């Protein structure tokens, strides 16, 4: 019922931007909290911030705040990420998680994640 | 903040077994919202356990989330073939989340 929708990859160039997206059916969207998450080779996780999908009001770990916007569409129920002036470091798999503000506070629902390859 | 697992877990189906998520800044508490995160093959993510010890709907009842002294831990009560994966935890310091490394637990069939 619950799902995510994350196109598989972008291919793009050093110092382009990219706009990720996260598709959300099955539930309403604006009573969930939304997170991005990025995910490098044996470096773990690195939470990049959330939005509120309701207010639109957002937070972010401070070392991705002058590299990543974070906006949603309500009528489509998307959530997006902008990443600016990528470098190498900015290769990962981006994941979009749904998290439970109102309710049990986990991170329930995860998006498959987009592969994101900054190459020449 | 940096949160520290256990790097990799051996198992056996049927045992119990036990992962923890220790805080750099001091006790973990309630106030953490310690989360159980697991990473299957294919980059395939489920939650688990939310606010310390909320299950999430449809995980079986053998993960159990508690505060074991100083740190958040999870708990698989007999241990299946199925559990073998990557478990992170995450912990909830005011106004951002910070994931520990992940553990790999290896259940040997
Ligand atoms: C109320 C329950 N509190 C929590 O779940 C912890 C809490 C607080 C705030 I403000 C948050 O922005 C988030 N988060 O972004 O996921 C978590």
């Known amino acids: 019922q619950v799902q995510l929708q994350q196109p598989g990859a972008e291919l793009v160039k050093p110092g382009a931007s990219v706009k990720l997206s996260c598709k959300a059916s099955?539930?309403?969207?604006?009573?969930?909290?939304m997170h991005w998450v990025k995910q490098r080779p044996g470096r773990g996780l690195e939470w990049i911030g959330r939005?509120?999908?309701?207010?639109?009001?957002?937070k972010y770990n401070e070392k991705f705040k002058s590299k990543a916007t974070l906006t949603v569409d309500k009528p489509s129920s998307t959530a997006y990420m902008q990443l600016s002036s990528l470098t190498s470091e900015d290769s990962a798999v981006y994941y979009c998680?749904?998290?439970?503000?109102?309710?049990?506070?986990?991170?329930?629902?995860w998006g498959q994640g987009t592969t994101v390859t900054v190459s020449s | 903040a940096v949160v520290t697992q256990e790097s990799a877990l051996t198992t056996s189906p049927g045992e119990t077994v036990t992962l923890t998520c220790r805080s750099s800044?001091?006790?973990?508490?309630?106030?953490?919202?310690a989360n159980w995160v697991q990473e299957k093959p294919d980059h395939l993510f489920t939650g688990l356990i939310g606010?310390?010890?909320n299950r999430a709907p449809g995980v079986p009842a053998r993960f159990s989330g508690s505060l074991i002294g100083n740190k958040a831990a999870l708990t698989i009560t007999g241990a299946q073939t199925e559990d073998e994966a990557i478990y992170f935890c995450?912990?909830?310091?005011?106004?951002?989340?910070?994931f520990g490394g992940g553990t790999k637990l290896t259940v040997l069939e």
């Open positions: 998680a749904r998290y439970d503000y109102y309710g049990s506070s986990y991170f329930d629902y």
């Open positions: 099955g539930y309403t969207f604006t009573s969930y909290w």
């Open positions: 939005i509120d999908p309701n207010s639109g009001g957002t």
């Open positions: 800044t001091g006790a973990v508490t309630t106030s953490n919202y």
């Open positions: 606010g310390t010890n």
């Open positions: 995450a912990l909830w310091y005011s106004n951002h989340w910070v």
